[PDB]
Design a binder for this molecule. Structure first.
Ligand SMILES: O=C(O)CN(CCN(CC(=O)O)CC(=O)O)CC(=O)O
Ligand SMILES: [Cl-]
Ligand SMILES: [Cl-]
Ligand SMILES: [Cl-]
Ligand SMILES: [Cl-]
Ligand SMILES: [Fe+3]
Length: 499
């Protein structure tokens, strides 16, 4: 085949390269390209920029751009187009706060058609890695700006990438076709249709009926019982990647009773994670003992796991004054029950399943977990504002983990800051996060990452649950389906049915 049909829970969005919801990162990465491209080994390679140099102080960077690249509408890609894109992004600077590069860029100038100069306020180390991300530093034809901006919308979603949006129908589908005037390698696939299918069971059904050819996504892609069955079905092809990121609970250090270190530590001994994974996730994921897997850059630190040990969990609670009243299973301290609210998306069957398991495990150690299932909007508002006891949370995968995930812990309107807000050493943690991003002493960088991650582990801010994987279900005719280096991209241009 050379046309494929796949599915996504939502439309790809209007494909503004510089904005977030409702734009889907993997679709922005199909159409728009970066100056430099992220590789699985952590390095970046030349992409729209063929080479670059930086000053001694590491604050000014000069990129030599390819001179052969056109936007899909035939307009040239050049340093002036790149500079206008940076201006457009930075004109919306406060929206990009989570990403420190957006706070670092002082100036971007086209010195010629091929020479682009970027100036930073400090020697920001993850500079190239952050240019490599799906958004916001990718390039739309400046003719498609609205009043010379993108923050208020764009006209046509015109990029330089291997795919061109053909058409979109809200709540129905999106169709992409191969860019026949692409500067790089031509994809084998000519057309990709995304059917919008919000429900994981309905996605599985669409595959079983032959309505779609490919499903690609994280642990939520389809029911995991069904995935296991599909993996044994000789008519189908399935894949499970190596783990890409962590799923955890975040505990609110500023809200009783999770404001108590002893409570947070006890919760971290109460969960048999292997059992949770075998029960709710059909044995398809890996147990997580730490916020970052030991395979994550800077995170191989010999941190001590809190292995499942309910006797220890009870002892920790007892020592902190949380004891069991006569005839009750829920602990009390100073008259107050040990009660914790777990908020999650109520219509997410998998979240609900894990929440039930967590509630059951915590009851065994005398903690009453109240399950609060709400719509997505409500849950995001709770995370932003710290209106939670516990929430499900995930890290962001490569290349965000650890530097960008850490960077964002400093932003008050995000779950991580909110979960951490009650820690006495939060200011120090935030100071050290600032310092790691700017340091060029590798020894100091490692020490800072060690200290930040060690404090977060030792303070039991998180309850890591699983390192989750990408999964794929496909018609055999499509062949082996590759994974992209960036956890949030889907490498459709690497699919090659005919070898
Ligand atoms: O989605 C956003 O608005 C920004 N992301 C930041 C990290 N994202 C990257 C992105 O959205 O560009 C990681 C991810 O969505 O996987 C979450 C946040 O600000 O807390
Ligand atoms: Cl937004
Ligand atoms: Cl979204
Ligand atoms: Cl499997
Ligand atoms: Cl009770
Ligand atoms: Fe995001």
């Amino acid at each position: 085949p050379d046309e494929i049909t796949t599915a996504w829970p939502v439309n790809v969005g209007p494909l503004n390269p510089h904005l977030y919801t409702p734009n889907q990162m993997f679709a922005q990465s199909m159409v728009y390209e970066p100056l430099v491209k992220y590789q699985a080994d952590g390095s970046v390679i030349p992409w729209l920029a063929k080479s670059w140099t930086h000053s001694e102080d590491g604050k000014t960077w000069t990129f030599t751009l390819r001179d052969d690249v056109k936007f899909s509408n035939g307009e040239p890609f050049d340093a002036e187009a790149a500079a206008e894109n940076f201006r457009a992004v930075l004109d919306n600077r406060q929206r990009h706060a989570w990403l420190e590069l957006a706070n670092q860029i002082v100036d971007v100038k086209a010195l010629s058609k091929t020479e682009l100069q970027i100036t930073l306020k400090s020697a920001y180390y993850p500079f190239l890695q952050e240019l490599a991300l799906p958004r916001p530093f990718r390039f739309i034809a400046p003719s498609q700006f609205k009043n010379h901006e993108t923050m208020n919308g764009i006209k046509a979603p015109i990029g330089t990438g291997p795919w061109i949006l053909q058409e979109s129908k809200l709540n129905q589908y999106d169709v992409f076709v191969r860019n026949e005037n692409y500067w790089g390698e031509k994809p084998a696939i000519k057309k990709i249709t995304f059917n919008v299918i919000p429900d994981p069971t309905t996605r599985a059904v669409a595959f079983e009926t032959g309505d779609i050819d490919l499903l690609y996504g994280n642990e939520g892609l389809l029911p995991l019982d069904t995935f296991a069955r599909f993996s044994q079905n000789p008519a189908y092809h399935t894949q499970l990647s190596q783990p890409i990121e962590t799923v955890m609970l975040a505990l609110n250090t500023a809200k009783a009773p999770t404001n108590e270190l002893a409570v947070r530590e006890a919760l971290n001994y109460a969960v048999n994670k292997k059992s949770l994974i075998d029960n709710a996730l059909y044995g398809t994921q890996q147990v997580a003992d730490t916020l970052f897997a030991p395979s994550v850059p800077y995170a191989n630190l010999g941190l001590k796991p809190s292995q499942y040990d309910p006797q220890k969990a009870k002892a920790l609670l007892e020592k902190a004054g949380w004891t069991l009243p006569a005839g009750k299973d829920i602990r009390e301290k100073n008259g107050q029950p040990l009660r914790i609210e777990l908020s999650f998306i109520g219509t997410d069957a998998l979240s609900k399943s894990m929440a039930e398991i967590i509630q059951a495990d915590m009851r065994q150690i005398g903690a009453d977990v109240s399950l609060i299932g709400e719509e997505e909007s409500s849950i995001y508002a709770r995370q932003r504002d710290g209106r939670f006891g516990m929430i499900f949370h995930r890290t962001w995968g490569a290349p965000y983990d650890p530097h960008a995930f850490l960077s964002s812990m400093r932003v008050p309107s995000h779950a991580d800051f909110q979960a951490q807000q009650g820690l006495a050493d939060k200011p120090l943690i935030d100071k050290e996060i600032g310092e790691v991003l700017a340091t060029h002493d590798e020894t100091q960088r490692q020490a800072l990452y060690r200290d930040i991650l060690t404090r977060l582990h030792d303070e039991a801010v998180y309850l890591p649950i699983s390192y989750i994987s990408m999964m794929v279900v496909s018609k055999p005719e499509l062949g082996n389906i590759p994974y992209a280096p960036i956890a949030t991209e889907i490498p459709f241009e690497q699919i090659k049915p005919v070898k």
